[PDB]
Amino acid sequence: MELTAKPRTPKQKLDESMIAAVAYNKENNVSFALDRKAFDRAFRQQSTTGLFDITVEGGETFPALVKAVQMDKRKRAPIHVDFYMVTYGEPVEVSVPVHTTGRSQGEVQGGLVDIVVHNLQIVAPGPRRIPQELVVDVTKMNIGDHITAGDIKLPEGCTLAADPELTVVSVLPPR
């Protein structure tokens, strides 16, 4: 990704298909503007747990993560982006997608897999190595079976911002 300018004035890029953005170091803070096309390919690939390299039209290239995204409600498209300039050894808290794997023995007698909370926000990994997904097995799961936030296998050096008796990926009855 290679933005260029950053003035408080948008007419330079608006139509040209660029998004207004800000990346903050927490010590260093920088406004700017990225090619839409790019950040689209990108944010689709890497999502919120992203991590990609950002070289401002001045030479200096810094790594970063995606902290928030701001949409046109009516066009359903990016107009602005909040960008976290990553640190090194401890970052912030990462929201990551619960998935599901294998034909559950719920969908075979009556019900269906229901990811009651799509996105699970954990505390920390050590940033360099962020979990980007989060597989949960479901094959054991019958109909009427809730998976609390505890039972999720974290990949070492990871904890849970979640209340870990909160219902996540649960299988629901029919009708």
Partner 1 sequence: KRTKFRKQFRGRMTGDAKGGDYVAFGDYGLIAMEPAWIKSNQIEACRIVMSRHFRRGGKIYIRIFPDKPVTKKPAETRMGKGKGAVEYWVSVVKPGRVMFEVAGVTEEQAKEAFRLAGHKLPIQTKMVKREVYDEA
Partner RNA sequence: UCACAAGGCUAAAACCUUAUGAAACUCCGAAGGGGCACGCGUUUAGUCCGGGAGUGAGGCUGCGAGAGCUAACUUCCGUAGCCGAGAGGGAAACAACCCAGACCAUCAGCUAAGGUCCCUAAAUGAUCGCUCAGUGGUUAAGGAUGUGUCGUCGCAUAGACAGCCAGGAGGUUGGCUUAGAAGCAGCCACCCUUCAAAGAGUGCGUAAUAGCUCACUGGUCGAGUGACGAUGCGCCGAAAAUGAUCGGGGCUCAAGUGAUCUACCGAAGCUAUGGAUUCAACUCGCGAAGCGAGUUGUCUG
Partner RNA sequence: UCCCAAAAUGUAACGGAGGCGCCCAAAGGUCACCUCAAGACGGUUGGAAAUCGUCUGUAGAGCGCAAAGGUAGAAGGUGG
Partner RNA sequence: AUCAACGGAUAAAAGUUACCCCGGGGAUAACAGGCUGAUCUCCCCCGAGAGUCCAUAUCGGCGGGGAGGUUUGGCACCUC
Partner RNA sequence: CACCCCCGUGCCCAUAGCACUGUGGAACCACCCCACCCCAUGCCGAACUGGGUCGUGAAACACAGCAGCGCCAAUGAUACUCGGACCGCAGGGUCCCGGAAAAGUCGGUCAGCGCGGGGGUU
Residues in the site for RNA, rule: CB under 7 A?
A: 8, 10-11, 20-22, 24, 26, 29, 31, 37, 67-68, 70, 79-80, 82, 84, 92, 103, 107-109, 116-117, 146, 163, 165-167, 170, 172
- 72 in Cβ contact with 80 (< 8 Å): no
Residue selected from 23, 39, 48, 86 as contacting partner 1 according to rule CB under 8 A: 48
Q: What is the DSSP string of 5-63?
A: ---S--TTTSTTTEEEEEEE-SSSEEEEEEEHHHHHHHHHHH-TT--EEEE-TTS-EEE
Q: Which is nearer to RNA, 82 or 133 (CB)?
A: 82
Contact 101, 110 (CB under 8 A): no
Q: Is residue 106 involved in binding partner 1 (CB under 8 A)?
A: no
**8 near partner 1, rule: CB under 8 A:** no
C-beta separation of 63 from 86 below 8 A: yes
Residues 6+ apart with CB under 8 A from 87: 127
Site residues (CB under 8 A) for partner 1, limited to 66-95: 68-71, 73-74, 76, 95
Token output for 12: 């330079």
Q: Which stretch binds partner 1 (CB under 8 A): 24-32, 50-58, 106-114, 141-149?
A: 106-114
The contact set with partner 1 (CB under 8 A) reads 44, 47-48, 68-71, 73-74, 76, 95, 111-114, 117-119, 172, 174-175
